[PDB]
């Protein structure tokens, strides 16, 4: 089990200059020959020749054309082959293979595989050599010609990088086609896809160069209606970079391929963009909502790849989050230009502080620069994604937009066709830095301990006014608790932007400021204040922390009712659901753990259910930011603020927290409801597919999430409202009509006609499987049973899959229930996945992720379903690795 350590990176002792390949696809095998142009590097020694190669069936191997004998001149062990330095020659030279590959078998979804009709291949991040030999590392940079042939009544539509540069007819009803690709590569940016495909397209001139870029948008043909959105959003994506960031494609032709399976969402190959079906292809009737800002965020990007990713690369995998993290942020920044609503920005923070802040505690805990990993696959987290995200975006608050710009384009201007590390980046935001500061000796030296060190750091603050002097001050403290990979914490450069707003009149006291936290703790006094402010914090949520604000629910509340920052607001209001949830739970748990005949509850604050109703009556307000308001924290948001989590506890506070509210505001939600159908369901645009009012659709999700809590509280004749809602036209109500009606004797009368709607779109009974899975039912497992024989079946699609299971493993009563039969299911889906597929068998384990952090009865069963898991013989490295590392064993 082969440790790699950041450390430890060297330079290969081999060059690779020139890649050219023929594939070729029969029905029962494809054939792949390869030359290399190689050369001797100036850092080689003498060394081995040893390429990657894994499940290559070797017809043969030569050196300059010459054949290489198995056993006495190389050897491999479907791994590595390794060509003894002996016969390795000392200048340029030339290595050619062919190997048999079976695209149809592969069912992983890595290197060369088939997708229902289409040939497609996934080489990020160790995939290449799934398809031939390769020194399989991104800092290999060579140049491809690449020959593609195949039937072609099955496979007319060929493509590959780069230019294609001949098309030709081949005996036996076959066709090939020839792409030249001159600009080096990794060859992790390599794709080929082969299939019966049908486009859209359209031509993009760009906005100072004036190149016309041809724009290929492709599926199958059942699905070529869907394909109008992606197209939309693709011409979106490249109006942003050319006018936030002033950077223009550079090839003449860029194409996006949907595919029915991929372990993902999408990925960046030059030129040949490759998605989930579920990432690309959408319509009014067959689609929820959510799938239009999916669409908008995956192509965008992936189109933001090709110049954080594609023109400026990375040295290792180590530098993963100078890619990842750094193209979140830009597709960030694109998303909320384009939606133009708050929500957008409120719903990745409401990710990252869920999902991520729960990695970020838990075994897995690592910083968005790693050490060492042991699988490349495990690689690609939430850490080092969206923590990532937000360690890009802090530069931003930091410089201001003018700065940053600046900074950025120094990056891509100096790093442009070259590899680089996390280090360049800094250098290059340093550089911004400095001209902002006016100051030379300014550096971000600090900064660079966002990248090294793990753990979710704690803000902390305290406060004084001082009347007669007309003075602030905010005390602040940063804490970062130890883990497994620091001892001792460092303080970080914290950025922290802040407003003071007068509780008398709403009105903010001071302009922009952003507080600079560069020690552990520090005092911020502001003068000329002429009455007590209440502090509105980390506006924008602008440093990825535990906030700790130190406010009264009162303060919260005027906050929450009065503040200018979407996210304060939201916070303020998480917050004073977090301390009711917290003094609830002990309440419940201290009953139940004394046996109590009786006991009492503390009511939820009657002043935070009347702003709760002001904001609601607020015509001017925002329908997305209600919706957030009238829903609890997440429960993956929750546990961490909890030690031993009792899940049915949590279950019973969350129940009478929201029985407290509805009590209250139910009629108001009915109210609601009903005067919000004519703007949230009009149809006006329904057939027009290039017409998104995301403004719209969150009045859709505002009545959604009002009908749920309705049903739950089993409003006066709900059900009434229940089965019309379930006649809309709109999928993300006659879904949601299915879930709400699962506290009524109508649901499997709901479950069949929704069924009935959702079976001949591939996609769409992918979300139907989804609210199922995620019915609030007491036959729940019953229910999946019936799935698993009736709908699901043997599918190895892995969002077959993970539709039937994932949902489900977020109902907090069933899922945790305390027999185990939870945490049993969902491992045997795990191993039985495993075999075809360690990729998405490692997804399935996200459920487990919190295992220590639950109470001690179950805590125990899922260790002991893991350890079972990890006791079985055929276990795949990729799970292996990960459950080591998870159980701290
Ligand atoms: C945030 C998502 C939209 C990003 C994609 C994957 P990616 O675009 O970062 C690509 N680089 C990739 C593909 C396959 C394996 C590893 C990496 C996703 O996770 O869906
Ligand atoms: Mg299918
Ligand atoms: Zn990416």
Redesign the pocket.
């Known amino acids: 089990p082969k440790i790699h350590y950041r450390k430890d990176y060297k330079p290969s002792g081999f060059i690779i200059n020139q890649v050219t390949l023929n594939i070729n696809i029969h029905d029962q095998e494809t054939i792949v020959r390869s030359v290399l142009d190689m050369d001797i590097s100036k850092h080689n020694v003498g060394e081995d020749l040893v390429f990657d190669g894994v499940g290559l069936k070797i017809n043969e191997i030569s050196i300059n054309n010459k054949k290489l004998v198995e056993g006495e001149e190389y050897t491999y062990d479907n791994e590595f082959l390794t060509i003894f330095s002996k016969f390795v020659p000392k200048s340029k030279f030339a290595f050619s293979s062919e190997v048999i590959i079976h695209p149809e078998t592969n069912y992983a979804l890595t290197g060369l595989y088939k997708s229902k009709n289409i040939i497609v291949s996934?080489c990020?991040?160790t995939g290449f050599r799934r398809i031939t030999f390769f020194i399989d590392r991104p800092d290999m940079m060579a140049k491809y010609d690449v020959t593609v042939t195949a039937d072609k009544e099955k496979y007319p539509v060929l493509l590959s990088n780069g230019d294609k540069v001949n098309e030709f007819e081949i005996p036996g009803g076959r066709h090939g086609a020839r792409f030249n690709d001159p600009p080096l590569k990794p060859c992790y940016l390599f794709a080929v896809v082969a299939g019966d495909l049908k486009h859209l397209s359209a031509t993009y001139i760009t906005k100072y160069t004036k190149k016309k870029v041809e724009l290929y948008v492709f599926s199958e043909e059942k699905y070529v209606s869907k394909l109008q959105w992606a197209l939309e959003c693709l011409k979106k994506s490249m109006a942003f970079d050319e006018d936030y960031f002033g950077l223009e494609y550079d090839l003449s032709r860029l194409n996006l391929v949907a595919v029915s399976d991929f372990?993902?969402?999408?990925?960046?190959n030059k030129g040949l963009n490759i998605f989930?079906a579920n990432?690309l292809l959408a319509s009014k009737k067959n689609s929820i909502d959510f799938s239009y800002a999916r669409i908008l965020?995956?192509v965008g990007?992936?189109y933001f790849?090709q110049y954080t990713?594609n023109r400026v690369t990375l040295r290792d995998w180590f530098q993963l989050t100078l890619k990842?993290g750094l193209?979140?942020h830009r597709?960030n920044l694109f998303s909320e230009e384009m939606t133009k609503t708050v929500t957008t920005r409120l719903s990745h923070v409401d990710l990252l502080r869920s999902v991520q802040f729960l990695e970020d505690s838990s075994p897995l805990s690592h910083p968005i620069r790693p050490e060492s990993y042991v699988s490349m696959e495990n690689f690609?987290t939430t850490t080092v994604?969206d923590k990532g995200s937000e360690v890009m975006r802090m530069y931003l608050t930091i410089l201001g937009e003018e700065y940053y710009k600046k900074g950025f384009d120094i990056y891509i201007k100096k790093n442009d066709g070259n590899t680089a590390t996390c280090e360049d980046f800094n250098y290059a935001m340093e550089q911004a830095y400095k001209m902002k500061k006016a100051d030379n000796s300014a550096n971000l030296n600090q900064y660079l301990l966002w990248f090294s060190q793990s753990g979710t750091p704690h803000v902390s603050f305290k406060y004084n006014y001082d009347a007669e002097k007309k003075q602030y001050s905010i005390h602040v403290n940063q804490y970062t608790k130890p883990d497994e990979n620091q001892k001792e914490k460092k303080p970080l450069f914290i950025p922290i932007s802040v407003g003071l707003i007068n509780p008398e009149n709403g009105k903010e006291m001071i302009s922009q400021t952003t507080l600079e936290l560069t020690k552990e703790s520090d005092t911020f006094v502001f003068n000329n204040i002429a009455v007590k402010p209440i502090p509105s914090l980390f506006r924008g949520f602008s440093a990825p922390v535990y906030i700790e604000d130190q406010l009264t629910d009162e303060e919260r509340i005027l906050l929450l009712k009065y503040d200018s920052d979407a996210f304060v607001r939201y916070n303020s209001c998480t917050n004073i659901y977090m301390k009711q949830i917290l003094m609830n739970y002990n309440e419940f748990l201290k009953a139940k753990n004394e046996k109590l005949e009786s006991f009492q509850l503390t009511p939820v604050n009657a002043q935070f259910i009347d702003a709760i109703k002001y904001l609601l009556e607020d015509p001017h307000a925002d329908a997305g930011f209600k919706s957030y308001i009238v829903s609890l924290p997440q429960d993956r948001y929750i546990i961490n603020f909890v030690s031993n989590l009792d899940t049915d506890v949590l279950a019973d506070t969350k129940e009478y927290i929201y029985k407290q509210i509805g009590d209250k505001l139910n009629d108001v939600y009915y109210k609601m409801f009903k005067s919000l159908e004519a703007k949230a369901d009009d149809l006006t645009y329904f057939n027009d597919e290039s017409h998104v009012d995301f403004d719209q659709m969150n009045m859709r999700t505002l009545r959604n999430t009002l009908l749920s809590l309705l049903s739950k509280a089993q409003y006066p004749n709900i059900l009434n409202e229940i089965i019309e809602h379930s006649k809309s036209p709109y999928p993300s109500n006659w879904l949601t009509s299915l879930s709400v009606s699962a506290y009524f004797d109508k649901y499997f009368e709901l479950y069949d006609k929704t069924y009935k709607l959702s079976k001949d779109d591939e996609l769409l009974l992918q979300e139907w499987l989804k609210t199922v899975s995620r019915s609030d039912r007491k036959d729940i497992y019953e229910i999946l049973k019936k799935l698993e024989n009736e709908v699901l079946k043997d599918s190895k699609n892995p969002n077959d899959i993970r539709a039937v299971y994932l949902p489900f493993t977020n109902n907090l009563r069933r899922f945790h229930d305390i027999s185990g039969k939870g945490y049993k299911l969902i491992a045997e889906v795990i191993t039985k996945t495993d075999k075809f597929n360690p990729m998405v068998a490692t997804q399935l384990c996200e459920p487990f992720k919190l295992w220590n952090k639950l109470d001690t009865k179950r805590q125990e069963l899922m260790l002991n379903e893991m350890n079972t898991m990890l006791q079985e013989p055929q276990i795949s490295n990729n799970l292996k690795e990960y459950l080591l590392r998870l159980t701290n064993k």
């Open positions: 996934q990020e991040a372990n993902v969402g999408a990925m960046e989930n990432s965020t995956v990007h992936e790849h990713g990842e193209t979140v597709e690609y994604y």
